[PDB]
């Protein structure tokens, strides 16, 4: 039921904080990829990432967050789940750790305000990732 | 060590969301009151609330959040920890539940924007309260 309780978190983070395209991926043993579990919209395409595949897969492989300040300017950015098109949008992907291992990945887009910092957003999302790993137990 | 890990949460909620005077109180068996554990500032006065005492104590007694849209307009508001003085400030206090009981109370001030709603803030803080009860175990 992460399909019902995480989009409550996502809805709120969209309304209060200007996050967009929030994506939760969880590890699938069968396909050995972290697979889309819930997103911030009305439809979850069940796309997956192998270790090291795109930004999302690298966060999974190396267990460390990655900030893309402008998605237009990083070709390692696959655009696999949301197939976006056309301003200066940032991307942040944090690891979800449980059992002291990386069980999957949370991410979000953000149009960056001059007065905000992506380090602060990243740390926040790592805090939300914590709250989600708790469900996972 | 909630004295070190919760003010990291509070600092971020101040920076990203305009919360002020964030207060965590935890139950003290010895005095039978929920006592200030951490706040959003450089100094924690160790004030406590008995069940039913002020807004904070009522949230504790009845295990249900309470929103004060304007603190100037509610006399049940004690102003016990922060002794504030002098705009139109809102107050929100949510229960912290663990072991299926109320172990204490989280609260925060907020100058309310026309385009924001206090129901959404309240639900958010209840989400943060969740994240804190997890520390508590």
């Amino acid at each position: 039921n992460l399909e019902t309780t995480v989009p409550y978190i996502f809805r709120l983070l969209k309304k209060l904080m200007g996050f967009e395209r929030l994506t939760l991926t969880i590890y699938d043993p069968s396909t050995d990829q972290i697979v889309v579990r819930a997103t911030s919209s009305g439809k979850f395409p069940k796309e997956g990432f192998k270790k090291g595949e795109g930004i999302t897969g690298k966060v999974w492989k190396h267990g460390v967050p990655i900030v893309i300040p402008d998605i237009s300017q990083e070709p390692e950015f696959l655009n696999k789940v949301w197939k976006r098109k056309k301003k200066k949008i940032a991307f942040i992907a944090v690891p979800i750790k449980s059992g002291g291992k990386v069980i999957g990945v949370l991410s979000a887009d953000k149009e960056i305000n001059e007065k905000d910092s992506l380090d602060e957003y990243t740390r926040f999302l790592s805090m939300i990732a914590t709250l989600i790993a708790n469900s996972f137990s």
Side-chain angles (χ1 to χ4, degrees), chain A:
Chain A
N1 195 256
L2 281 171
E3 287 98 359
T4 319
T5 77
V6 163
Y8 285 142
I9 298 170
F10 285 177
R11 227 159 269 130
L12 225 34
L13 296 204
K14 271 179 65 178
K15 289 212 180 79
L16 299 185
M17 306 187 80
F19 284 124
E20 303 176 14
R21 306 203 182 68
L22 298 120
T23 310
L24 174 62
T25 48
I26 301 291
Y27 178 79
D28 188 32
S30 193
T31 59
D32 192 40
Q33 295 180 17
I34 60 186
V35 172
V36 175
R37 180 59 49 114
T39 79
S40 71
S41 65
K43 167 190 59 156
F44 311 162
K46 300 294 275 197
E47 302 278 353
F49 294 84
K50 322 188 216 168
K51 264 167 206 289
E53 182 179 355
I55 305 318
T56 305
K58 290 169 219 311
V59 175
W60 178 25
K61 197 195 180 181
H62 298 126
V64 160
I66 305 188
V67 190
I68 310 297
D70 184 2
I71 284 181
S72 81
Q73 291 313 320
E74 183 51 274
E76 272 169 25
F77 187 83
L78 288 182
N79 198 30
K80 181 182 226 210
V81 175
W82 291 93
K83 292 142 279 203
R84 319 150 171 75
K85 180 161 121 166
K86 303 181 186 191
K87 286 189 194 177
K88 302 167 183 178
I89 202 79
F91 181 73
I92 297 167
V94 296
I96 292 156
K97 311 216 219 104
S98 219
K101 295 188 160 179
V102 174
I103 194 60
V105 170
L106 175 56
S107 76
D109 286 12
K110 180 67 179 117
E111 333 171 33
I112 174 59
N113 272 336
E114 186 197 353
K115 277 175 191 67
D116 281 313
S117 87
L118 303 165
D119 179 66
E120 278 164 3
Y121 278 111
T122 302
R123 296 200 329 271
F124 188 69
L125 268 197
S126 275
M127 198 160 289
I128 299 285
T130 289
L131 176 65
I132 280 166
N134 293 326
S135 294
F136 215 83
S137 174

